[PDB]
Amino acid sequence: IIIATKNGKVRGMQLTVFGGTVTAFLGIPYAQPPLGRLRFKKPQSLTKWSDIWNATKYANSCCQNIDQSFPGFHGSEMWNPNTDLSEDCLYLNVWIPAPKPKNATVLIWIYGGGFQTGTSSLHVYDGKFLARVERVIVVSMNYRVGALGFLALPGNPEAPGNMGLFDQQLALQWVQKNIAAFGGNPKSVTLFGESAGAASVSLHLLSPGSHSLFTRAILQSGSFNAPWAVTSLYEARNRTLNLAKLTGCSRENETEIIKCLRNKDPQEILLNEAFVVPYGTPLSVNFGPTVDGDFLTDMPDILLELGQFKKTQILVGVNKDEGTAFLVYGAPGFSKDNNSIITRKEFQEGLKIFFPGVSEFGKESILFHYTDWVDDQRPENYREALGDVVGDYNFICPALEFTKKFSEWGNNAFFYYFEHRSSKLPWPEWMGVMHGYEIEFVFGLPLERRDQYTKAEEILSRSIVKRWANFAKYGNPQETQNQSTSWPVFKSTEQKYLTLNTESTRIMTKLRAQQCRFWTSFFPKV
Ligand SMILES: *[C@@H]1O[C@H](CO[C@@H]2O[C@@H](C)[C@@H](O)[C@@H](O)[C@@H]2O)[C@@H](O[C@@H]2O[C@H](CO)[C@@H](O)[C@H](O)[C@H]2NC(C)=O)[C@H](O)[C@H]1NC(C)=O
Ligand SMILES: *[C@@H]1O[C@H](CO[C@@H]2O[C@@H](C)[C@@H](O)[C@@H](O)[C@@H]2O)[C@@H](O[C@@H]2O[C@H](CO)[C@@H](O)[C@H](O)[C@H]2NC(C)=O)[C@H](O)[C@H]1NC(C)=O
Ligand SMILES: O=S(=O)(c1ccccc1)n1ccc2c(OCCNCc3ccccc3)cccc21
Ligand SMILES: *[C@@H]1O[C@H](CO[C@@H]2O[C@@H](C)[C@@H](O)[C@@H](O)[C@@H]2O)[C@@H](O)[C@H](O)[C@H]1NC(C)=O
Ligand SMILES: CC(=O)N[C@H]1[C@H]([C@H](O)[C@H](O)CO)O[C@@](O)(C(=O)O)C[C@@H]1O
Ligand SMILES: *[C@@H]1O[C@H](CO)[C@@H](O)[C@H](O)[C@H]1NC(C)=O
Ligand SMILES: *[C@@H]1O[C@H](CO)[C@@H](O)[C@H](O)[C@H]1NC(C)=O
Ligand SMILES: *[C@@H]1O[C@H](CO)[C@@H](O)[C@H](O)[C@H]1NC(C)=O
């Protein structure tokens, strides 16, 4: 199957999925490769090609540091890139139903990874199941990460910041201009993403240049108001300047810094990214989104508070144990290979690691709020408190605040709490329902009966897949056929949310009420 796009013909490949067929176009270029003088710049448009472009394998992933903390361990290596790293990485993928659809709704996936890592070719982002089962079109793109995607000297077009977000935006433009040739409906495009991908989706809701490029949005475990998601212009300058010092590129002409950085091998830039922060946390967002005056016209908290965003429906949610994954990347006493019973002293040191530069009083206030136990003899008390501290502060309370503020301007919002721990999860049981492990259910991997998931997980994934697809198609994440719990709208008053689990799907209210009042209303003052 060959499709004529605006810039040339592309050839795809046929996939067998569940006794049917999906057509995949893997690795279509959507921008000029950002090499040489184009490194650190906004992505430039593609010029035509005259032959057929073979989109039959995933393209290069963008340059990035790799998680080496657990060599040989699937729980960490499943997130590492599975194609060659290259600056030549601005490519996207398209899965379409067979036979070709007539006007299919389009799902555009934006991966996470702290804005420092990630790739669209991971196994858990394979869009072929969604295309097969729901007859939607799935698109995913690679976008630049790390310093190469987010180095910033604001106002300087040699390195303006937010290049990785402009990569994503150019891919959204490509879908608007080209997806009807694949049978897609450019007027029915839903963005979905997880972690930094979800933060990205929320920033497209704020960016005037993305407003005409999509219809609706799904935010899995992230939002821009999360404390890790936006770099201040002061942090960003200190970090750009530190990178230049570390690479021998310090100059008084800021533009000459950039030209010096453009002569370094990518690996020299990657090696020094970790050190631009003096005292950072486990997996620090060294180079992330900034208020650049282009993609982001103002501090996003102000835009959110004053209703300056695309008015549409949103689907937002979080996992039960968002914080646990990060504990084994630096908190003392923690290990994926034992049950990580920690002491009060270790909990206090863990707060030092996750809240550097917070006052002694601020850290005491966290301890005060999280250590007033039901039973103080329970050995797991501090282990579980530290995970909840990290998950509530970094993910759950910001997602809930985002949903409240967004819905106050009149739109329908739906909030979920994912509490199922995958039967195959390679991480230990104390880590629970971790960050990132709803993704395989959203993409329908448990629908493949070969792949060792349980029957209950197939049913759960099937329901989630239908709810997500109904949200994208119709703005309403219901499963209408199988006597399912109806998913109520989230309103700032009642704050109803839907729990997702294999047993009983339930309507609850005011998730983490006490904890989020601490994080949202008190802790920003310290
Ligand atoms: C802003 O940057 C300075 C410089 O950071 C140092 O040099 C970089 C190239 C990199 O290698 C960093 O890891 C270095 O720390 C920071 O100043 C340092 O601050 C720490 C403690 O705050 C101190 O021990 C170092 O001696 C300082 N070094 C210098 C040269 O002043 C500074 O903390 C950074 N952050 C802020 C908010 O200013
Ligand atoms: C759980 O394990 C941690 C980490 O120890 C790891 O696993 C072991 C096989 C051992 O070889 C360690 O070196 C590994 O790093 C234990 O934390 C360590 O505890 C010792 C003594 O208490 C201390 O010297 C180390 O600094 C600790 N490592 C840290 C803080 O990273 C922890 O005690 C184990 N807990 C339980 C309940 O078994
Ligand atoms: O939300 S975060 O900003 C963040 C949250 C809390 C504290 C600090 C930073 N953040 C998330 C991922 C990430 C990153 O890569 C991830 C590499 N492993 C992925 C993984 C997921 C789940 C289990 C095990 C591994 C780099 C930098 C920041 C990151
Ligand atoms: C692009 O692909 C063309 C067709 O290749 C045919 O189908 C693919 C899936 C392979 O299995 C191949 O063995 C078949 O012949 C090629 O003819 C063409 O050379 C390719 N273009 C480039 C630039 O490599
Ligand atoms: C930078 C990079 O990954 N380049 C290319 C790889 C490798 O150079 C070789 O396979 C040797 O390892 O080969 C291709 O020709 C291919 O697989 O069709 C294209 C691909 O982009
Ligand atoms: C696809 O649907 C849109 C409305 O969502 C409509 O305007 C457009 O003409 C349709 N295109 C088709 C059916 O080819
Ligand atoms: C040095 O900075 C000036 C502005 O301060 C700029 O016009 C010039 O292009 C820079 N040098 C080079 C070699 O680009
Ligand atoms: C509804 O239930 C049937 C079995 O009664 C099942 O095969 C089907 O996949 C379910 N549909 C959804 C969308 O969950």
XYZ file of N, CA and C and ligand atoms in Angstrom, residues 134 459 462-463 466 479 481-482 484, ligand 8:
41
model
N -10.265 -0.662 17.390
C -11.199 0.453 17.413
C -11.306 1.180 16.084
N -9.994 -8.144 29.804
C -11.269 -7.434 29.915
C -11.041 -5.977 30.312
N -9.603 -4.124 27.369
C -10.647 -3.934 26.363
C -11.553 -2.765 26.725
N -11.945 -2.670 27.999
C -12.799 -1.575 28.437
C -12.087 -0.229 28.346
N -11.839 0.871 24.722
C -13.128 1.416 24.272
C -13.403 2.809 24.862
N -18.291 3.275 28.223
C -18.448 1.957 27.613
C -19.936 1.677 27.725
N -22.087 -0.583 26.188
C -22.752 -1.816 25.774
C -22.797 -2.898 26.843
N -21.911 -2.861 27.825
C -21.679 -4.012 28.686
C -22.029 -3.717 30.144
N -21.712 -1.140 31.995
C -20.534 -0.581 32.636
C -20.914 0.592 33.530
C -18.516 -6.699 25.919
O -18.725 -8.067 26.375
C -18.398 -9.095 25.428
C -18.779 -10.418 26.061
O -20.105 -10.404 26.573
C -16.917 -8.995 25.086
O -16.553 -10.034 24.180
C -16.638 -7.620 24.491
O -15.251 -7.483 24.195
C -17.053 -6.514 25.467
N -16.848 -5.206 24.861
C -16.125 -4.231 25.428
C -16.010 -2.957 24.643
O -15.587 -4.369 26.526
